[PDB]
Design a protein around this ligand. Structure first.
Ligand SMILES: COC(=O)[C@@H](Cc1ccc(O)c(O)c1)NCc1c(COP(=O)(O)O)cnc(C)c1O
Ligand SMILES: COC(=O)[C@@H](Cc1ccc(O)c(O)c1)NCc1c(COP(=O)(O)O)cnc(C)c1O
Lengths: 480, 480
């Protein structure tokens, strides 16, 4: 295809995207397809001769769309929100056009330099401590990561490298493997699965700290675990404190855990993938207090800040902890400005080497929406979460398991876990709304998450009507 | 922004992208900016109120474009090509529109099911052994990875998990750390920096196998290294054989190394990031012979197959080696069809959890170009590489260090490394063309890579004229 053909087809794809978004409420949020639906509907081999764009866009509606779970339908209340903003889509078109692979500054200076300033913009929006900000002064800085799971793994690998060199400095004969056998990392019992995967990838032991009644990590439980493990020969090195847990959007206490991790020389990484976007609002910034004790902080703008996937923002106190570890400098990836402190090569900050101009999406979203526009988007979602909470609190057959703060409501029918599992099956079978469950201790709990950018008060009210209607049918069958 | 506004601005961005591509030859391939250029040109904080789209697109030309190294200019001959095709750009617009985070099949069935069939399409285009193909039969399958560096790390982590369980099965008292101390992996001395980073991340020792006169790994050198290391207590477990090396596009011998790795129970991963795209042409498929002995194979369609970054294709013989390792099954990521063999959850195949609908780009590129269209794109680039080779072979002042096969020419002025380093400095200072160097043993060697999709015979001829003119100036200064 040439450019003149892309002018026509590209503007047609713009119309198809806008039409799909304007009629997404007419779409069923969850598909009716069964596993293995797509392969019988398309040929087994690639076409030797070119197919037409009209046949491809027809196959999108006929084959692809039926097997699509619409994350951006207003009736999608599953997991956590994912970002869909038109400014980010416009920037992705320019990003693919420039087509730069910015592993180094020489690969494309604008790709690296725009990312560093955008991380300052975001850091100042969240009112982060100045130690995390690279304002052409200071040892800290930020980087776009592909995912919060990758950012957690990168933080663990940097902590593992630092503790190995410290222990080998004290005991030069100590081998790395013997250190690895005693290394232990910590997380909450409400932590995301990325923490355990990172520990399994890093070859280190991971232990879960018991949470309190509010499902938050406290200083007492951490001190009890450190007391047991250090007496057993284990060397704590890494800690993941979670703000806005996947289960119930609970918040670990950084003011209690932070100072403990600093005394114990434990690297403190803060995982606030979902809740981090709300910290640009001053009413929720108090939940971030204690990040000054953290060595690394990460949140996902591709969740609740309208910067389409992929975009994960990660700041560090000392860049040399990241740039010094896993450092390779091949001649084919060398340039003359590598030693300049004004810039950097983000390849050392990430597991991959290649990377794209993702900072254009942050630039576009921040400028076209503004800080006040993003703050209004956050507050409308939290207001809608409290509106769903009010409806549940008006029915004595239901109960709210955890305090509602930032767009997630954990609710359940009072009684067995079987009656709540039956209600979820009825909901997902009707396919009018989409919700996902969680397990708080031994309790089966349903989750209601405000996700879509176009969600309104009407959609939440209709979803509660659907849940209340199915609850009576399920509660009736329990009495028979 | 709403959809009606995106209709206008989106079609304007289509025009800007097409205009940039049609006038990319008027752009200087390498920027004249210095490090730290971008921060003084934009505000230090995000705008509280929204900025206009006209001011943003103006800042793209005024600020962003001067700091852009144009990978898709015909005069870009640096590193290796990166993919820029309009069909992939159209699919990326639809991918961001659907906005699915397909960590599971329930997240969006079409995202996972289309990817599995596209990997079969590609595998059959490369005429891969049927063991790597998931055609709803067999234990093998393919997955899109974010990068070849990530695919190499994933293969090493799966090999590390398998060797640990085998050794612990033979010796139940053996701890993992003691096994890690003896684990050693292997690669060529011409291997990419991703192999060493993967070994550093995996906490295992990595050793380089000496290459022959053609810079290829041979059975004799591998047997000598295995003989030394196994006598020293080291346990070989992982091997990365490279097809199309970053340095000189050399090809390791899989027919020699493969059977050795199978006897030694060494996981064999094949890294063919750049050269893998040419294997869809039957004249180059002989270079892939021996992949039948490999446990994993990876190549980058985001290099030489017009599928824009990111897209890395990785096949495996046994999916359970990947899906079994680092397996986590939280209730919030559970669905009812997880146990179906007709589908899968690609989250276990990758370091991250989230992923986007990247298989749309493979679908669009394969259908709009066709197999014959992609084969013609490969052969035109190889023809242009042989044309540059012919020009160098007509000048006795120059020499070709390695055989030219698949789009890369390694050349240098006969004599010192200082005269070739001076020639490269003159070339990159003139900014008319962009080339990068490499080191073959102790020899400084310049590289010429056919990169742009719009490159023609005229561009290569003008680049050789520029190199020949600067060579005489540099050779003159050496005699003074
Ligand atoms: C809530 O369910 C979880 O599995 C994820 C789902 C999810 C939601 C939205 C996006 O965009 C997404 O990528 C994943 N919320 C996850 C989560 C992660 C996972 O980070 P990445 O998906 O790897 O970026 C990490 N930490 C926390 C606290 C999470 O909730
Ligand atoms: C040739 O220089 C190398 O650093 C890379 C550069 C490069 C070129 C094009 C794209 O798209 C790119 O992402 C990187 N060629 C690299 C290379 C890799 C790196 O894989 P990823 O960049 O992580 O996908 C791996 N293996 C080989 C053999 C390479 O040549």
């Amino acid at each position: 295809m040439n450019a003149s053909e892309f002018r026509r087809r590209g503007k047609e794809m713009v119309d198809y995207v806008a039409n799909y978004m304007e009629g997404i409420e007419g779409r069923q949020v969850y598909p009716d397809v069964e596993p293995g639906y797509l392969r019988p509907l398309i040929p087994a081999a690639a076409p030797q001769e070119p197919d037409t764009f009209e046949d491809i866009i027809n196959d999108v509606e006929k084959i692809i769309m039926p097997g699509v779970t619409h994350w951006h339908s207003p009736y999608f209340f599953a997991y956590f929100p994912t970002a869909s903003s038109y400014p980010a889509m416009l920037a992705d078109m320019l990003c693919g056009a420039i087509g730069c692979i910015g592993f180094s500054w020489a690969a494309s200076p604008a790709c690296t330099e725009l990312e560093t300033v955008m991380m300052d913009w975001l850091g100042k929006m969240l009112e982060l401590p100045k130690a995390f900000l690279n304002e052409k002064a200071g040892e800290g800085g930020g980087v776009i990561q592909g995912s919060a799971s990758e950012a957690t793994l990168v933080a663990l690998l940097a902590a593992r490298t630092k503790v190995i060199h410290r222990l080998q400095a004290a005991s030069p004969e100590l081998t790395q493997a013997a250190i690895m056998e005693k290394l232990v990392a910590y997380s909450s019992d409400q932590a995301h699965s990325s923490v355990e995967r990172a520990g399994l990838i890093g070859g280190v032991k991971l232990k879960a700290i018991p949470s309190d009644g509010n499902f938050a990590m406290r200083a007492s439980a951490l001190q009890e675990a450190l007391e047991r493990d250090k007496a057993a020969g284990l060397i704590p090195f890494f800690m993941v404190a979670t703000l806005g847990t996947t289960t119930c959007c609970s918040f670990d206490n950084l003011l209690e855990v932070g100072p403990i991790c600093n005394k114990e020389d434990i690297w403190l990484h803060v995982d606030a993938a979902y809740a981090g976007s709300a910290f640009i609002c001053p009413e929720f910034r108090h939940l971030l207090n204690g990040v000054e004790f953290a060595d690394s902080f990460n949140f996902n703008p591709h969740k609740w800040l309208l910067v389409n996937f992929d975009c994960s923002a990660m700041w560090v106190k000392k860049r040399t902890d990241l740039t010094g570890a896993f450092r390779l400098d091949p001649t084919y990836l060398k340039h003359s400005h590598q030693d300049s402190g004004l810039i950097t090569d983000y390849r050392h900050w990430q597991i991959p080497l290649g990377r794209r101009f993702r900072s254009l999406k942050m630039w576009f979203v921040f400028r076209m929406y503004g800080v006040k526009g993003l703050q209004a988007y956050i507050r409308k979602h939290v207001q809608l979460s409290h509106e769903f909470e009010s409806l549940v609190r008006q029915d004595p057959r239901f109960e709210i398991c955890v305090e509602v703060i930032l767009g997630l409501v954990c609710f359940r029918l009072k009684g067995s876990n079987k009656v709540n599992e039956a209600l979820l099956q009825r909901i997902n079978s009707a396919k009018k709304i989409h919700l996902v469950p969680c397990h708080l201790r031994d309790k089966f709990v349903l989750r209601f998450a405000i996700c879509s950018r176009t969600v309104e008060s009407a959609h939440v009210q209709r979803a509660w009507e659907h849940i209340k209607e199915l609850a009576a049918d399920v509660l009736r069958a329990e009495r028979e």
